[PDB]
Amino acid sequence: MEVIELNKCTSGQSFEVILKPPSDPSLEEIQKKLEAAEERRKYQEAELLKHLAE
Amino acid sequence: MRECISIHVGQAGVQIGNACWELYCLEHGIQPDGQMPSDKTIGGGDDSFNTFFSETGAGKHVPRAVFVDLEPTVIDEVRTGTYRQLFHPEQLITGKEDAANNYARGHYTIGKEIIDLVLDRIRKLADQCTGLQGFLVFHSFGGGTGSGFTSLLMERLSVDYGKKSKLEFSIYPAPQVSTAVVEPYNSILTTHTTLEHSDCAFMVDNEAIYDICRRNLDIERPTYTNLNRLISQIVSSITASLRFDGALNVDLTEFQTNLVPYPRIHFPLATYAPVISAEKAYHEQLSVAEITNACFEPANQMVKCDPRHGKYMACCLLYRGDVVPKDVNAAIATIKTKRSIQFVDWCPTGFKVGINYQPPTVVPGGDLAKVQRAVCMLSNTTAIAEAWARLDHKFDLMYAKRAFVHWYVGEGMEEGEFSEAREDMAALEKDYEEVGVD
Amino acid sequence: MYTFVVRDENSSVYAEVSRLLLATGQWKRLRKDNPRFNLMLGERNRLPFGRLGHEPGLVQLVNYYRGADKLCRKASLVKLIKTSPELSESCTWFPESYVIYPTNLTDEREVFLAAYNRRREGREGNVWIAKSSAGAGILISSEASELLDFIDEQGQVHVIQKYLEKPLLLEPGHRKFDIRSWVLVDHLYNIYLYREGVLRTSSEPYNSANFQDKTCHLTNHCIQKEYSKNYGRYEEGNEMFFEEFNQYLMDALNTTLENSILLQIKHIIRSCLMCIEPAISTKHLHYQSFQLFGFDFMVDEELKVWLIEVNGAPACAQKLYAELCQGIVDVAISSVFPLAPTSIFIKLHHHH
Amino acid sequence: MREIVHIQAGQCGNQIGAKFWEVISDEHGIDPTGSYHGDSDLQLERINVYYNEATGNKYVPRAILVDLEPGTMDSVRSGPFGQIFRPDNFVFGQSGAGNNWAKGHYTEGAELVDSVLDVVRKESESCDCLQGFQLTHSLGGGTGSGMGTLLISKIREEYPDRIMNTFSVMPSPKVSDTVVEPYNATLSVHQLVENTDETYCIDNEALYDICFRTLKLTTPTYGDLNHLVSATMSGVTTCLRFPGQLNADLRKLAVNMVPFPRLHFFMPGFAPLTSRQQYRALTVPELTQQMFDSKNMMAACDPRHGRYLTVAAIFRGRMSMKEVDEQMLNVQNKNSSYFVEWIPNNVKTAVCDIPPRGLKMSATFIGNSTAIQELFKRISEQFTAMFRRKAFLHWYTGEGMDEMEFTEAESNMNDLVSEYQQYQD
Numbered sequence A: 001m002e003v004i005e006l007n008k009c010t011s012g013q014s015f016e017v018i019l020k021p022p023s024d025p026s027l028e029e030i031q032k033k034l035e036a037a038e039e040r041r042k043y044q045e046a047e048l049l050k051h052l053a054e
Numbered sequence B: 001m002r003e004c005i006s007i008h009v010g011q012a013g014v015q016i017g018n019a020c021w022e023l024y025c026l027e028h029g030i031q032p033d034g035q036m037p038s039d040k041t042i043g044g045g046d047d048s049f050n051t052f053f054s055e056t057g058a059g060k061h062v063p064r065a066v067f068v069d070l071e072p073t074v075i076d077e078v079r080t081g082t083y084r085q086l087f088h089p090e091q092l093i094t095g096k097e098d099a100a101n102n103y104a105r106g107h108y109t110i111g112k113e114i115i116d117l118v119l120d121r122i123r124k125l126a127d128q129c130t131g132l133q134g135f136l137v138f139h140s141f142g143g144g145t146g147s148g149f150t151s152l153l154m155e156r157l158s159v160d161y162g163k164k165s166k167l168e169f170s171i172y173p174a175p176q177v178s179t180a181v182v183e184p185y186n187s188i189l190t191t192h193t194t195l196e197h198s199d200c201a202f203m204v205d206n207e208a209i210y211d212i213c214r215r216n217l218d219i220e221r222p223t224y225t226n227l228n229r230l231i232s233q234i235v236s237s238i239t240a241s242l243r244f245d246g247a248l249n250v251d252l253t254e255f256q257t258n259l260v261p262y263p264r265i266h267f268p269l270a271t272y273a274p275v276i277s278a279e280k281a282y283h284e285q286l287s288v289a290e291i292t293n294a295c296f297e298p299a300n301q302m303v304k305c306d307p308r309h310g311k312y313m314a315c316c317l318l319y320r321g322d323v324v325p326k327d328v329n330a331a332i333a334t335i336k337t338k339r340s341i342q343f344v345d346w347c348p349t350g351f352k353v354g355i356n357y358q359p360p361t362v363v364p365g366g367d368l369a370k371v372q373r374a375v376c377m378l379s380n381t382t383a384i385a386e387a388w389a390r391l392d393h394k395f396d397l398m399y400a401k402r403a404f405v406h407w408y409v410g411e412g413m414e415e416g417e418f419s420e421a422r423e424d425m426a427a428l429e430k431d432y433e434e435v436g437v438d
Numbered sequence C: 001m002y003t004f005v006v007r008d009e010n011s012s013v014y015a016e017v018s019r020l021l022l023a024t025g026q027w028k029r030l031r032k033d034n035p036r037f038n039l040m041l042g043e044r045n046r047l048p049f050g051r052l053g054h055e056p057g058l059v060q061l062v063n064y065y066r067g068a069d070k071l072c073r074k075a076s077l078v079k080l081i082k083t084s085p086e087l088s089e090s091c092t093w094f095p096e097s098y099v100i101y102p103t104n105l106t107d108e109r110e111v112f113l114a115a116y117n118r119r120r121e122g123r124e125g126n127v128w129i130a131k132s133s134a135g136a137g138i139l140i141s142s143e144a145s146e147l148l149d150f151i152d153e154q155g156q157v158h159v160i161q162k163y164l165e166k167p168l169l170l171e172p173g174h175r176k177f178d179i180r181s182w183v184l185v186d187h188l189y190n191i192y193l194y195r196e197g198v199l200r201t202s203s204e205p206y207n208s209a210n211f212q213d214k215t216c217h218l219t220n221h222c223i224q225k226e227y228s229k230n231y232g233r234y235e236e237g238n239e240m241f242f243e244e245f246n247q248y249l250m251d252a253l254n255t256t257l258e259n260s261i262l263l264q265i266k267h268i269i270r271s272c273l274m275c276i277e278p279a280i281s282t283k284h285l286h287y288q289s290f291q292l293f294g295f296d297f298m299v300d301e302e303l304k305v306w307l308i309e310v311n312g313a314p315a316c317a318q319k320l321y322a323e324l325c326q327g328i329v330d331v332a333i334s335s336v337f338p339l340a341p342t343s344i345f346i347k348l349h350h351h352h
Numbered sequence D: 001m002r003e004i005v006h007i008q009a010g011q012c013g014n015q016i017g018a019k020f021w022e023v024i025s026d027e028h029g030i031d032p033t034g035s036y037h038g039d040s041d042l043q044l045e046r047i048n049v050y051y052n053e054a055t056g057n058k059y060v061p062r063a064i065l066v067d068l069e070p071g072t073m074d075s076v077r078s079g080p081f082g083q084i085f086r087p088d089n090f091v092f093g094q095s096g097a098g099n100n101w102a103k104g105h106y107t108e109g110a111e112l113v114d115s116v117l118d119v120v121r122k123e124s125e126s127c128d129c130l131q132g133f134q135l136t137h138s139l140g141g142g143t144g145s146g147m148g149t150l151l152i153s154k155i156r157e158e159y160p161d162r163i164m165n166t167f168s169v170m171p172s173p174k175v176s177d178t179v180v181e182p183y184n185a186t187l188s189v190h191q192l193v194e195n196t197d198e199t200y201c202i203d204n205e206a207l208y209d210i211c212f213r214t215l216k217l218t219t220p221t222y223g224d225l226n227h228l229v230s231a232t233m234s235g236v237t238t239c240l241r242f243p244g245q246l247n248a249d250l251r252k253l254a255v256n257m258v259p260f261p262r263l264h265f266f267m268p269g270f271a272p273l274t275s276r277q278q279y280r281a282l283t284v285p286e287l288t289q290q291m292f293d294s295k296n297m298m299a300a301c302d303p304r305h306g307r308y309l310t311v312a313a314i315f316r317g318r319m320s321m322k323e324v325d326e327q328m329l330n331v332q333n334k335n336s337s338y339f340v341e342w343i344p345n346n347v348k349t350a351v352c353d354i355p356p357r358g359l360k361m362s363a364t365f366i367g368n369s370t371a372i373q374e375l376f377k378r379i380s381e382q383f384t385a386m387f388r389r390k391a392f393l394h395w396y397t398g399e400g401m402d403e404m405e406f407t408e409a410e411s412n413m414n415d416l417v418s419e420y421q422q423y424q425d
């Protein structure tokens, strides 16, 4: 039950009690993901318009 | 002094962000017009509260915050609310139609077209900071914006601010206050793509806040205003160290140092007490031992789970009010001889304690009664895995039938991203089991 | 109209409880995966406790206490007793036991041999029994070498404990036996002891000069009905009920089952369950638990009661299924979900 | 500012569409001349959703009236609120459609469809942010069925990423005008399967039985049946026209109701339905028990014959929202054998403080139930009864159609039934 690193200031204090010792995707790569999904939306809408044109 | 920029995404993040900044102003003595009489340095200063507020030549204390929503109704409350004068228009960003609770729509379809605008507005706030620590990001799991656009913003912040820490306040989906059904999908999608980008996240389960509001506050059917005012108290308890003089959790990095020994396992459980109804005739003031003992009752946890059947990796005790170290240690001793507190063998069995003498501030007319002392415990338990298990099971039920998947594929998402995100959650669940179970 | 789910088709007990629940016309059984249930008759292994109590408006109840395995595992019970101050290492009603891991894997090998050498040198009876939870696999021997070598040949944790060389033998027959007590713990953590017990007797004469033939030493209902040639001679199915056993104690020993044995049993059930109450109580939990336990006791020739083990999913005696299953529905299920005596249980009062 | 464009086509579509604008105009305080006269700001909060604001604070519905003959729309223009509609928004011909899907879709209707789209484009071009479209029509005639489904096909081509919901009256031999109704209904259903995000299936027989059996109306009229549809339409759009719990747009509402793109046909319901014992206060238990009762549903399908994929309910009036949840969570947890268990929390409830005219409180039911397959089985059976003999086909082949197109519509509907059947097991 040890108290270590006791710090006191005007608005409070803090300390540590020990009870027992122990035993990314680049900017380019993101643009590709965003544009690849945008391209799948364009393709799906094209098949819809191609369907409606038929 | 180092600055923190808060980012509020989606309806949940914006309304929660609104409640916190209201609370911050009442705590730091700031008026709705941005004026702060106690700030003797006009138009400048490197005080502790300056980590969250900047100052104009006219003495206005302006939050270091950005509000983002794909639809404007929630952010229009801020533009016209009580604290409209605090923010300037550049800080409030709104689209014209939301993501319809569709992750793919917020991340890809709409997110792609507004991500650069948000980064620009954030860059402006960053350009006012002499030493930016990082970002606090508020959002929901369930919303199409809160889930889908946040994960895109997190990826870009990791690129544009490599050496900056990013903490989250995330709202876990609860059926009692949700008319949606696809929220398990969004939660898992956003956790997968946000995992590697978030240093420390505080999950708040709406189900937990709902019961605390009915149980302790005697609200029959709580509103978002009720939930948010309680949630902003816990948020204030967690961010107080950054805004006040002190020596514990004085910068965003210290949160990971003290609460996250393993990177992926960065979801500390939060417990708060006491929550006393204001309508009560007058409540007996609880002691340090009583409120500390309450921190091990599931009824006051931000995520309902049983820590008695987990292992602790870290534990932080944040006190506010009339509390002295003597009483803390005295209570902690008693609890160890009465409670089930099993730590992992590769972590010390101890508690870091912070005390701020200023008692919890309460919004006038709110539901919470003014107490003389309160505490918030941050403990990294494997028991919080129960929440990942619950959420992952709901995902499996719908995904077996591919229910609602066409809504995501229709916005440009590949079905493979579903199973890819799910297998990541399976790996996350296995990590908790290797750390907690024998 | 209450709803329940069945997730263990092998439980003879709760099969009868479910059969009774439906008979009331006020309980509806749902598919085993329907989460909108009031009562879960859960599985034995890996019961998903984390998914309980998260259905809006549904008060949910389960028939297993999360964490009670600490008390129903051979190796866990030994650890709980030695490390729990409420029971201490000097616990007088539990045989000396040691946790021994096979060498192919803390472990108490040296601690066991230290106590073993002490007995051998002191001329005292030095007979032990090695067993594990992964058994139908038990070995009784007086040599420490045989016990440890038997465990190494296996691959699971075992327990070596002292063998009661002075058991109380029933007459006529000169035969061993054990006592099974069923205990129900409701959501409020009241400890109810079923008024009906059973003595699983051995139909073979106890022989202390031959531990090789384990038919007279092991009183398991399956062993007697398989490796015993006098099964059912003295009592039907080698099952003597408290009425007869009590009558015997009066004629033979001039004492009652209550004074001589039951007081110690009630004391043991309390000490065990009160110990783990802080760890498994669902008092302030988002769901409610209750569980039926099966305690196994041994009695020596001094009429001292010894705890053998505790079962987490016990079966019942054929003649007592109806009365006990109905008793579970009365105090455990209907107490939480009421419907539109002279209790068969004995409430063991205690401080929570 | 999430605007909705309303289109009503054909006799049924315009007579039902008219009563709809009559109902909500009263709820928003709009008089027959377009001038507001309410006493609550909630009436104007979401007023732009369905109304345009003209000079002098006038509110003009955002509605387009379409027909191939002038008769019905002459009635509307001379009807109660006839003056409230934009004069330019009346688009009609003189030929008529002769209750022939081919005339509404391929010949007569094709000659008029472009001028309708010009009005639609005009209304859309003024919307700050278009939510989507809603169409009222019947499936048993020629205009609302044949030309309505043609309008949807051309609206989707020009607005591919906008929501399209319809209120579709399904024919029944009990309330029938012509024998070719099964033909027209089968041909429209496939258009709706492909091109609507939501279709509220309103069965004329269910409406009839409700008027005769529940309402005790000796001799029901089309007017009586339409009173039920107006009330149901006012119910489902309550969450769009007033502020409350949910503030979702058409797309978010569809996202949570439609787990599969083709299975988007809803069974609507309404409560109370009282016969003239009409002043008695209706309790929350009664509102809930009726709302889920089959007799209160307008699809003429027994839900106990299938399973709910998703269920929504809107409660209107000053009531105990706590006691609301108690009765809802009671109906679910007492009949969970009819809800699919692989969509967690598929029963959602919302409250609105404003009750309908002359009702302390009410509830509107919206079920995405696999039992709707019984409705398509009926239509298919009646279709094949005639088509096997090619009866009345000449009316359609004379308009350029071929028998093959009928065979395809037949297969499409029977596939639709097979899709509902797999999800019911």
Ligand SMILES: Nc1nc2c(ncn2[C@@H]2O[C@H](COP(=O)(O)OP(=O)(O)OP(=O)(O)O)[C@@H](O)[C@H]2O)c(=O)[nH]1
Pocket (backbone or CB within 6 Å): B009, B010, B011, B012, B013, B015, B016, B069, B070, B098, B099, B100, B101, B102, B106, B140, B141, B142, B143, B144, B145, B146, B147, B171, B172, B173, B174, B177, B178, B183, B206, B224, B227, B228, B231
């Ligand atoms: N605690 C709390 N939760 C909220 C609040 N608003 C919404 N939620 C929860 O957030 C989830 C819905 O996501 P939203 O945040 O509303 O959606 P969004 O982020 O705006 O994204 P969109 O789909 O585009 O609207 C549900 O689980 C709600 O219960 C709030 O103000 N406070």
Ligand SMILES: Nc1ncnc2c1ncn2[C@@H]1O[C@H](COP(=O)(O)OP(=O)(O)CP(=O)(O)O)[C@@H](O)[C@H]1O
Pocket (backbone or CB within 6 Å): C095, C129, C131, C135, C136, C161, C162, C163, C164, C165, C176, C177, C178, C217, C218, C219, C220, C296, C298, C308, C309, C311
């Ligand atoms: N220390 C000991 N001294 C004497 N006999 C013992 C003993 N340990 C076990 N036994 C004998 O073994 C039998 C029960 O063994 P044990 O209970 O350990 O195995 P088990 O758990 O598979 C049977 P059950 O679970 O049904 O009670 C009893 O009949 C008892 O006579």
Ligand SMILES: Nc1nc2c(ncn2[C@@H]2O[C@H](COP(=O)(O)OP(=O)(O)O)[C@@H](O)[C@H]2O)c(=O)[nH]1
Pocket (backbone or CB within 6 Å): D009, D010, D011, D012, D013, D015, D016, D097, D098, D099, D100, D138, D139, D140, D141, D142, D143, D144, D145, D169, D170, D171, D172, D175, D176, D177, D178, D181, D204, D207, D222, D223, D225, D226
């Ligand atoms: N509920 C209701 N159904 C109608 C009405 N008018 C016609 N119907 C039904 O709609 C079908 C006839 O279609 P109709 O609208 O007259 O054809 P259209 O004018 O060419 O579009 C038949 O099945 C009728 O039962 C009405 O006013 N109300």
Ligand SMILES: O=C(C1CC1)N1CCN(c2ccc(F)cc2)CC1
Pocket (backbone or CB within 6 Å): B179, D165, D198, D236, D237, D239, D246, D250, D253, D254, D257, D312, D313, D314, D348, D349, D350, D366
């Ligand atoms: O599609 C629509 C609108 C076009 C009418 N709705 C279905 C979903 N409804 C709903 C009700 C309660 C609720 F809690 C959630 C959703 C409301 C209406």
Ligand SMILES: [Ca+2]
Pocket (backbone or CB within 6 Å): B039, B040, B041, B042, B043, B044, B045, B046, B055
């Ligand atoms: Ca200053």
Ligand SMILES: [Ca+2]
Pocket (backbone or CB within 6 Å): B158, B162, B196, B197, B198
């Ligand atoms: Ca990083």
Ligand SMILES: [Ca+2]
Pocket (backbone or CB within 6 Å): D111
């Ligand atoms: Ca012509």
Ligand SMILES: [Mg+2]
Pocket (backbone or CB within 6 Å): B010, B011, B071, B098, B143, B145
């Ligand atoms: Mg939103």
Ligand SMILES: [Mg+2]
Pocket (backbone or CB within 6 Å): C309, C310, C311
């Ligand atoms: Mg056993």
Ligand SMILES: [Mg+2]
Pocket (backbone or CB within 6 Å): D011, D012, D141, D177
């Ligand atoms: Mg007609």
